[PDB]
From TrEMBL, chains B, D, E:
Region (Disordered), start-end ranges: 1-24
Protein name in UniProt: Structural polyprotein
Domain named Dicistrovirus capsid-polyprotein C-terminal: residues: 29-236
Subcellular location: Virion
Residue stretches of biased makeup (Polar residues): 1-24
UniProt organism field: Black queen cell virus
Span of the entire protein shown here: 574 to 853 of 853
C-alpha cells in the first residue's frame, strides 16, 4: 500500500450511512431529529387493514395468474391448436401483477409452472396435449416441426389430459438457457414455448372450456436495475 | 470508505487491494475459466510459448544461407509508411506496411518489458525440394577485429530433414555476459548489454524462400515493465482505398506466413520506417 | 436528543474557564504566562498591614 | 458548553434537557405551586374539565327544539368582521365580533391539537317557566339517504327538571368509527373521519333562549400538537370608537353568557367570517 | 518539534527548557570554565563584589569633609552633553562626558534591577600628607525639621590611618524602613521607600582631592529585573575630533581614577545631563 500520513483531515468513516441500496458519504455534519421517545400502538388498535401474513416479491411470482380463459369446439381436429401458444415467460410476466414486481430487477432464473383447468360434464370425450418447446428464439428452424404434430410434441416434455378424467393439469418447466438467467430489461432468450394441440377431437357438439394459469417457483431474482433501454 | 481526502486508489495500493464495492458487499464472482474455457490463463510467461510466424526471407537469390540477428526477433517489427502513386492520375495515396514481417504472440508480451532472459525458439518452413536445414549461432563480432570469420569449428550444429519433418525446429540458448540482456536498438558502444548473436539457416539444395516462426523457449523471462507499445488497429488490415492499378490497404503486408493468402494490394513506391522522432 | 455527528469541529470544552462570575468560552488558542516557579514571602516578612482575621461581606 | 459548532438547542433536545446555566451551577428552584397557589397544574388534560359558556340560540322563534353539530363546539367559534355605518355621517367603521358565541377553556386547548377522542359535556341554561330539558343524539346523516328521519326510537334520552335543578347537564359520548376523530371542517367526502352527530335540546314549554356551556368529559383526549391558533387580544374587548348612534367595540360580542352584562355596542350592518384565505 | 502552530519559544518556556537541536541530538558541550579560565562564573551576586572607582571630589576647596548620598553610588553616573567652542573659528562641536564620575562593576549589575537590599562598600584614596580618614553616616533629614544637625553624638565612627594603610576601606550598612529599598531618583514625597543616608569622609589634615571606589558588600542583593540600561560604546573613549585648541573626545572623562592618565581633551563650555525626555 502507498502509505499516507494524514493529520489535517479526519477519516470520517461515520457520516457514511447506507440505506438498503443508496450509500451517502458525507463531510461536515449529519443531523437527524423528530418527536422523541417513539412508541407504537399495539396490533389490536390497528391491523384491521392487513392479513396475518407478509408478501415478499418472490411470492407475487409464486401466485398463479390467469393467462387464457376460452373454449374449443368439435370442429378442431387432431394436431391442431386448441389454445394460443404461450412464450415463457414473456406472455406471463407481461401481466401487471408480475410486471410491476419484476421491475427494478435485472433478470429472473426460476422454473415456470403452467397449469390448465378443464370443464367437462361426464358425457364429453376427447384428449388434449400440452407441451413445451425449449428456447424457441434460439432454434427457430425447428419450432414449427416439433409442434405441428402430436407424437413430435409428446416426445418432448409434455402433459396430457383425458377430458373425462382430468379436471386440472400442470406442467413444470424448469429454467433452461445457454445463460444463467432471463434478461428482464431486454426480454431476451425465452426458455420455452408452450403449445396446445388436440390429441383427439370432441365427440359431441358441446365445446370444452379451459383456464390457463402460470406462476414461477425456484425463484432467483437478479440485481436491482433501472431497466430502461434506448430507442 | 469509497471517498475521502487521501488518495483513494494510488498505484502501490491498486496492486494489492481493491476499493470498497458500490454494493458495500462482496463484489467478487468465483473463477470459472476452467469450467467454460476448459483452460486457465494467469501468466504471460506461459502464453509466450505459443509460436507464430515472424519474418520471411524472399528478396535474396537462390542462396544456401541466411544470417540475421536473434534479438531483433524479440522486438516487434518496424512499421513502415508506404507511398503509393496512381499509375493513371499520378496523385499520392499513403498507408502503412509490414515489410515481410509481422509480430508474434511473443512480441505482444516482449514489447511491454525492458530486458529479457532466456532462449528463443525458431522454427523454419521452406519450399519444396529442400532436403535439409541446418542451424548455427555465431557471435556476429570477433571483438577487436574489423572482420568476423566466415566459418567456425566449435559452434553448434543442428540438422533437420524436411521431407520427413516438414518444420525445422531449433532452440537458440541465452548466451550473453549479463544476468538479463537487452533486445532493442541503442547507441551504446563502450561495452555491451546485449548478447549479439547471429543465426545461420542453411538449405540443401539452396533455396530462395525461408519462412520463420518464432516463439518463447522454456526459460523465457522478461524483467522490467515499461508500458504498452505503439500499436496499430487490426481492423485496418481489411480497410482499403481503391485506385486505378488496384487496391491500397491501410495496413499492407507481405506473404510472411507461408499459409496466408496474398492480399490483393499493389506494391508501394517508397518505404519509410516510423522513427521515434516522427511521433506528434 | 437530536443526534449530531460532528467530525470537523472539536468540542472545545476546555478553553472554557469561569472565573468566579464570568465565563469565557473560547475558540482558537488560550495562552497564559508570567514569571515561573512562583513563591511567596513568609508572613513575618509582610503582614504588618493586616489583622489576624478575615472580613467577609456578611 | 453553552456555545459551540453543533446546534446547541434543537427541538428534540429541548424536550428532554436544558442547556447549562449562565451561573454554571444549578439554576432550578423547587416547585412551590402547592404551597402558594394551594393547587398544582401540570396537564391540560385536567384543565379542560372546566366548563365555560360557548354559544347561545336566540334568533329562532319559540321552538321546542334546537339541533346543532357537536364537533363544532370543540372548535373555537368563527371570528367575524363587522361593518358599522354611522346613522348620521354615513362613513363606515370596522371592528371584530363573535356572533352569539365565545371560546371555552376547552377551546383554548383543543385548538392546539389536530384530533380528539372522548366525550363532550354540555350544560344548558334556559329562561324562566321552562319545566324540562331533554337531550338526544342522532347521526345527522342516514348514510345513503337524501334525508334523515325526524324521530328516532332507540336513541338516548335524558331529562332534567329545571325548577328543581336549574342547569341541565348532559354528557355526549364518543361515537365515531375511528380511534381518534377530527373536529374541524374539511372537504373530505369519500369516507369520513369525523363522527357526525346532532344533539337536540328540547324545552317544555317551548322557549326561545337557550344558553349552552361546554366542557370536557372525563375521557377527553387530544392527539397531535399542531400549533397556536389565530388569536385576538382580550383587551380589545373594552376598546371602542364612538360614533353618533352609540359605541363601536373593537371586539363586539353578544349575550352568549346568560350572566354577563350586555355591552353597549350598536348592532353592525354586515358580518363576514375571517377565511383562511383572508390572512396576509 | 522545532516548528508548529503554538508559540515555539515564549519567555516562560525559555527560562526552563531549550528547543530541539538542529541536529536532533544532544547539542550541549560540558562546562570547562574551571579548566581553562581557572574559575567559574555563574551569578552576578558575586561579581558585584569587585570594587572599581566611582567618583572624585575635586571642585571644592581644602575642606575637612565631603558629604554625599549613598544610594546615588548604586546608580550609574549621569551622562552629560558637552559643548565645545573652537577658540579660533568659533563653531560648536559636541560630544559626551562623565563629570568626575564613571560606572563600577556594581553599576553594571544594579542598572538591570529595580530595588536593592544590603550594604554598600566604599574605599577612599587621598592625596599625600593626609594622616587619617573618618567615615560616618547620618540620616540627611531630621524628619519634620527644616534643617538637619551639623553634628551627631551616637553615629558610627570609623578611622583609617593612611600612611600605614593607604586605602581607607569602609562598609556602610543597609538602614532603611523597608524590606528592599530603592536607589533611583523619584518624585515620591508622601512617605519614602529609600533609606536616605549621608556619608561624611574627613581628612586630617584637610585636603582637596578625594577619590572614591565603590563595591558591593557581602549582603548585596537586587530584586526585580527591569532591563538593560541606556549604554554608551566603550570604543567611543578613544575617538576624537581635532580642533584648534586641542582634542575633543567623543566620550570625555575626568581623572576620576587616581591611577589613570589624564586624557588630552580640552575642557568643554557647557554641560547638560541627558534627561529621560531627551530620548528620541
Amino acid at each position: 500500500m502507498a502509505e499516507q500520513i494524514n493529520e489535517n483531515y479526519e477519516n470520517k468513516q461515520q457520516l457514511v450511512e447506507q440505506t438498503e441500496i443508496t450509500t451517502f458519504e458525507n463531510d461536515l455534519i449529519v443531523l437527524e431529529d423528530g418527536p422523541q421517545m417513539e412508541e407504537s400502538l399495539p396490533f389490536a388498535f390497528h391491523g384491521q387493514h392487513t392479513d396475518n401474513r407478509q408478501h415478499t416479491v418472490v411470492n407475487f411470482l409464486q401466485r398463479p395468474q390467469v393467462i387464457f380463459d376460452s373454449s374449443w369446439a368439435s370442429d378442431v381436429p387432431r394436431n391442431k391448436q386448441f389454445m394460443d401458444s404461450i412464450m415463457i415467460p414473456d406472455d406471463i410476466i407481461s401481466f401487471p401483477m408480475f410486471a410491476e414486481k419484476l421491475k427494478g430487477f435485472s433478470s429472473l432464473r426460476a422454473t415456470a409452472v403452467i397449469t390448465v383447468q378443464f370443464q367437462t360434464q361426464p358425457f364429453q370425450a376427447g384428449r388434449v396435449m400440452l407441451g413445451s418447446f425449449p428456447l424457441p428464439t434460439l432454434n427457430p428452424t425447428r419450432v414449427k416441426f416439433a409442434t405441428n404434430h402430436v407424437s413430435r410434441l409428446m416426445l418432448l416434455n409434455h402433459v396430457q389430459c383425458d377430458i373425462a378424467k382430468e379436471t386440472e393439469v400442470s406442467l413444470r418447466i424448469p429454467f433452461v438457457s445457454p445463460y444463467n438467467s432471463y434478461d428482464l430489461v431486454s426480454k431476451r432468450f425465452p426458455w420455452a414455448k408452450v403449445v396446445g394441440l388436440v390429441y383427439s377431437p370432441l365427440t359431441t357438439t358441446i365445446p370444452v372450456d379451459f383456464i390457463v394459469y402460470g406462476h414461477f417457483e425456484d425463484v432467483e431474482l437478479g440485481c436491482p436495475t433501472s431497466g430502461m433501454l434506448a430507442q | 470508505s469509497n471517498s475521502g481526502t487521501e488518495q483513494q486508489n494510488p498505484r502501490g495500493s491498486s496492486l494489492l487491494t481493491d476499493p470498497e464495492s458500490i454494493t458495500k458487499s462482496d463484489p467478487y464472482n468465483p473463477n470459472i475459466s476452467l469450467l467454460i474455457s476448459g483452460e486457465v490463463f494467469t501468466n504471460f510467461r506461459n502464453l509466450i510459448k505459443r509460436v507464430n510466424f515472424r519474418k520471411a526471407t524472399t528478396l535474396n537469390g537462390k542462396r544456401i544461407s541466411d544470417t540475421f540477428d536473434i534479438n531483433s526477433l524479440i522486438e516487434a517489427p518496424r512499421l513502415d509508411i508506404a507511398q503509393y502513386v496512381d499509375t493513371e492520375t499520378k496523385e499520392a495515396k499513403y498507408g502503412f506496411s509490414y515489410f515481410w514481417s509481422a509480430p508474434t504472440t511473443l512480441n505482444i508480451v516482449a514489447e511491454m518489458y525492458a530486458l529479457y532472459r532466456g532462449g528463443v525458439r525458431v522454427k523454419v518452413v521452406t519450399e519444396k525440394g529442400v532436403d535439409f536445414v541446418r542451424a548455427t549461432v555465431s557471435p556476429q563480432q570477433t571483438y577487436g577485429s574489423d572482420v568476423a570469420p566466415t566459418t567456425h569449428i566449435s559452434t553448434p550444429l543442428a540438422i533437420e530433414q524436411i521431407p520427413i519433418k516438414g518444420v525445422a525446429e531449433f532452440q537458440i540458448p541465452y548466451y550473453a555476459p549479463c544476468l538479463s540482456s537487452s533486445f532493442r536498438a541503442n547507441s551504446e558502444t563502450f561495452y555491451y548489454s546485449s548478447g549479439r548473436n547471429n543465426l545461420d539457416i542453411a538449405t540443401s539444395p539452396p533455396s530462395i524462400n525461408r519462412y520463420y516462426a518464432v516463439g518463447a523457449g522454456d526459460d523465457m523471462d522478461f524483467s522490467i515493465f515499461i508500458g504498452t507499445p505503439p500499436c496499430i488497429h487490426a481492423s485496418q488490415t481489411a480497410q482499403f482505398t481503391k485506385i486505378k492499378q488496384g487496391k491500397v490497404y491501410d495496413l499492407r503486408y507481405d506473404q510472411y506466413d507461408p499459409f496466408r493468402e496474398v492480399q490483393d494490394g499493389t506494391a508501394f513506391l517508397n518505404a519509410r520506417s516510423i522513427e521515434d522522432s516522427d511521433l506528434l
